[PDB]
Each structure stands twice: as C-alpha cells, then as structure tokens.
Design a protein around this ligand. Structure first.
Ligand SMILES: Nc1ncnc2c1ncn2[C@@H]1O[C@H](COP(=O)(O)O)[C@@H](O)[C@H]1O
Length: 531
C-alpha cells in the first residue's frame, strides 16, 4: 500500500549460528595481529587472538561446569574491555546471555535477573555488592565470577580462575568447536530496554545484524585495524549490536567509560579514530567546546548518533565544527534487535534518522484510524522484518500488544517519511503533551532550549492543568557561571515557537536533567520536579 520496503542486502545472510559466524571473522583478525578492544583511559589492549582464545576457553569451561544448550548466564557490569568474553562464549555454546549494567538500582536488578534466571553471574568489581544482594532474593544464582580482575577478589573466582578450575590442564583453545543451533528458535540474548521486561533475541536476529554491519551503504566497510570510539553502554542493544558488528568488521574498539571533554578529544587524536558513536546528550558538550582546535582530529570521518531524539540544529552545527557532511543516525528499539532505520552512506539529510534497512518494511499509521499514511504525515511507526524479537520472557500478553495480528511491531514512536523515503523520528507517543487539542512533542521544545548559549541541557514534560489538560514545562541546566531567570527562558522560547508550544507550565533549574542511559528523558521524574 503505503509500505516502505528496504533493499536487498549487499552481503547475504551467511550460514551458521551467531557464534559460528563470529569465530569465522575473529579467527581472521587474530592471525593478522589486530587489536579488538582498547580501554582509552588505561590504554590496555586486547588483541583479537587473546579475545578469541579467552572466549573459546570460557565456552569449554561453561560446558564442563554443566551448562547445556538453552542454559542462562548473566553479566552485571559497567563498560569494561572484558565485557564481551561471556557474551561471545555464550553465543559459541548456545547458552542465553542476559546483560545488565552496574548502574541499575537494586530493584531493577532483582527484577531483571528474576526474569532471566541465570545460573552464573559475571560481575565487575564495582557491581559485586549489588549482585551479592540480588543473590539473597534470586536464589537460583549458583556462582558469581569477577570479570575485570586478574586475581581472585574478596573470595570470588576471577575469570581466569574459573577457566582454570573448569578446564583440563592439557586443553588447547584450538580444539574447541561451536555448537550449531536452531537459528530462528534459539534465544541468544535477553535484553532490557532503557520494571524491565526480558526481550528475547535469537541467533537469526543477530546474524541479520551482521549482514547490516558490513553493508557498504547501511553499515561500515570491512577495514581491520581501523579505530572506532564508543561511549555507548554495552549491556543495552545500542552498545551490544554496534560492538558485535565492529568485531565482524575487524575494527579496533576504543572504549571510553566515563566521559570527559579533554579525555574524549585526546582519545580521538591518540588513537586516530575514524569514527565515533555517541548518545545525543554529548553533542551539547561538543557544540560548546573551546578545545576542538588544540587537537588533531583530521582522521575522524564519521560521527554517529542514536538512542534518543537529536536536535537537527545541534547535529548540523556539530557536523560543521568537525568538517563533516552530516551526522550518521540509527533508529531502533530493543525489540527490533538493533537499528532498522539507518543513514545511508553519502545520503545524509539534516534531522533524518535515515532509511529502512535491508530486509525490513516500515509504515506510518494514523493515530485515530489505524490507516497507512503517505509522505509528510505524522503517525505511529510500525516495522516488520527478521530482527523482530521472539517475544518477552513469560509475558505473552505484552508480546501480543506490541506485535499485531499481521506481524507488524508497533514502536510507540511518532514519525514521518518524506517524498524521498527518508524517515524522521519525532518523539515517543506516550510523551506528547496534550495541550487542549494539540499534541506537542517535548523533543521539539528541547531543541529550541538547546540552541541557547546559556543552556547546557534541558528536558520537557507536561504538567497537569484543569483548564488545558496539560501544559509544557521544562527543567533546565545552565552552563557553569551563566545565569538566567524562569521568565528569561520563557520569553526566549515564546519568541521562537508558535503559541501552543509556549512553556506555560513553568521552568525549573536543576543540576541534572533526569535521563535514561541511552539519552531518553524521564518524563515522570520531570513532572514531579515541576509539580
Ligand atoms: N534515532 C533516534 N531518534 C529518536 N528516537 C530514538 C532514536 N533511536 C532510538 N530512539 C528511541 O529509543 C527507543 C528505543 O530504546 P529502548 O526502549 O531502550 O529499547 C525508541 O522507541 C525511540 O523512542
């Protein structure tokens, strides 16, 4: 009808499980002498050969430990260079992996691990306290392994100890064989979005991502040794599936845990990074930065973003500062594995999230009538393709509400496409501010607020009102030293937008705009601050 269809992929989906394909590629970069992971802050490298060997050795160890196909393990860790060893090993042996982050509240962690039910938890040092407390409630956790220590830590086996205690002394990594699985049925990963539900992704979902990752238009060209800088969380699909695609491509993954303006720029220079992937929050910092010029950034050819709405004006300004044509955006959901809309190489358009990825379909549906829309009409984005999740763990009800009777997943996101089939993502449906008969997107007002020289960060939500239903209000973080009044912010917004978008609900100044880990505004937190 009004359906938008993505092209055929350059590279067909290869045969084999997610683990078989990963080993195939990693083996190649291993012989080359390539480095897989670099911690930018400590300067610690892991070559592809060491990473491959530790993943194979861990795979054997887990089998010897007694884990069968369709068993479960989890991670609870902030970004560290060892993060993917349990992930890759799990994929090699057909055991489901549930990534969580150290930054979870205990309530989130008890609920998340309560759903996935892991036999072993690979924890970082910093996460150990929280994982010990989770174990008192989620009592099916037998073992905790410390991921980022070379020696045992507080009485818990470190990763090397567990491999050593669970492989024979004569075992060579090279004698290990990956397990073939039923691809469309085998759960590979249990993901949480940014109380969490368990999103089940299969080996088929993942091997499709691998095809996109190496696509010359929708991914990155294979080029071993090329350094990429990432600041995105690894436990989330944003970080999970960009990173796995980088390993397929042979890239050197430069990881930066805590963001810092000077460290960020030093890193880009010192590793001659070709590309950088960011959450939208960080653009605000780069647009204001006075330091850009004191660094050699001549090698940077691509700046990528995702996770949350990106101000088209801030994005353009940042592209201009780094002398690039545009920003490469990706858009997707945890439920669709990874990005299903991606900026095509050499087809940038300011404010667009990109175009439908190979093997996917997209449509925009009217909010009222559920009917398909032509270009330039806003509505709910729906998508269909082989990266749709298997379902939520033990939640058939929520699964049915998301994927309709015709196999279309309803994103809960509002957007539109233009005459050229470029997709623009506006905001989340649940976030629209219902001011009288208007539906006002907070992202549109956030953008205006971000263009202000005195405003570092902003967030917008609706405030209840007996007359109008909802009034747009904002929380605003000023640049250090700078100073503004509630009315100054309101007057500046009023001069730029139409009547309906005015900040009738007030402005409050805060230290930190409440946000999720991938950049999405916590509208509930802002409502409360404002009221
Ligand atoms: N490029 C993007 N532009 C606007 N919103 C995005 C973009 N990418 C992801 N999102 C938002 O993040 C959501 C998926 O994140 P998550 O719930 O953590 O799986 C999407 O439904 C969108 O609301």
């Amino acid at each position: 009808e009004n359906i938008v269809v993505g092209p055929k992929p350059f590279y067909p989906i290869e045969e084999g499980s997610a683990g078989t394909q990963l080993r195939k590629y990693m083996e190649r970069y291993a012989k080359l002498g390539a480095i897989a992971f670099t911690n930018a802050v400590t300067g610690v490298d892991y070559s592809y050969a060491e990473y491959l060997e530790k993943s194979c050795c861990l795979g054997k160890a887990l089998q010897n430990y007694g884990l069968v196909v369709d068993g479960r393990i989890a991670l609870c860790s902030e970004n560290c260079e060892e993060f993917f060893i349990p992930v890759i090993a799990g994929l090699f042996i057909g055991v489901g992996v549930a990534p969580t982050n150290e930054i979870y509240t205990l309530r989130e962690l008890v609920h998340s691990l309560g759903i996935s039910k892991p036999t072993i938890v690979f924890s970082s040092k910093k996460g150990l306290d929280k994982v010990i407390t989770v174990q008192k409630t989620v009592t099916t956790i037998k073992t905790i392994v410390i991921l980022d220590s070379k020696v045992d830590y507080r009485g818990y086996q470190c990763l090397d100890t567990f491999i050593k205690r669970n492989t024979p002394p004569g075992f060579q990594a090279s004698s290990f064989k990956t397990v073939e699985v039923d691809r469309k049925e085998q759960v590979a990963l249990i993901m949480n979005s940014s109380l969490p539900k368990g999103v089940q992704l299969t080996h088929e979902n993942i091997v499709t991502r691998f095809s996109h990752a190496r696509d010359p238009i929708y991914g990155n060209q294979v080029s071993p040794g090329t350094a990429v800088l990432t600041v995105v969380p690894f436990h989330h699909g944003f970080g999970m599936f960009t990173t796995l695609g980088y390993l397929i491509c042979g890239f050197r993954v430069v990881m930066l845990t805590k963001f810092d303006e000077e460290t960020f720029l030093k890193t880009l220079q010192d590793y001659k990074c070709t590309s950088v992937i960011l959450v939208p929050t960080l653009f605000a910092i780069l647009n204001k930065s006075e330091l850009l010029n004191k660094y050699d950034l001549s090698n940077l050819v691509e700046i990528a973003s995702g996770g949350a709405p990106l101000s088209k004006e801030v994005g353009e300004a940042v592209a201009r500062r780094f002398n690039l044509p545009g920003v490469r955006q990706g858009y997707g959901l945890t439920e669709t594995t990874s990005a299903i809309i991606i900026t095509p190489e050499g087809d940038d358009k300011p404010g667009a999230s990109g175009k439908v990825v190979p093997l996917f379909k997209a449509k925009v549906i009217d909010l009222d009538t559920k009917k398909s829309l032509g270009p330039n009409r806003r509505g709910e984005v729906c998508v269909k393709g082989p990266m749709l999740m298997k379902g939520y763990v033990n939640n058939p009800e929520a699964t049915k509400e998301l994927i309709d009777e015709e196999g279309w997943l309803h994103t809960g996101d509002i957007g539109y496409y233009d005459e050229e089939k470029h997709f623009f993502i506006v905001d989340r449906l649940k976030s629209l501010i219902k001011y009288k008969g208007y539906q006002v997107p907070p992202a549109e007002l956030e953008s205006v607020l971000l263009q202000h020289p005195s405003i570092f960060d902003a967030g917008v939500a609706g405030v209840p009102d007996p007359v109008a239903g909802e009034l747009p209000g904002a929380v605003v973080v000023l640049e250090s030293g700078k100073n503004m009044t509630e009315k100054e912010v309101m007057d500046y917004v009023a001069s730029q937008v139409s009547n309906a978008k005015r900040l009738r609900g007030g402005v409050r100044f805060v230290d930190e705009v409440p946000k999720g880990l991938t950049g999405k505004i916590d509208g509930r937190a802002i409502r409360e601050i404002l009221k």
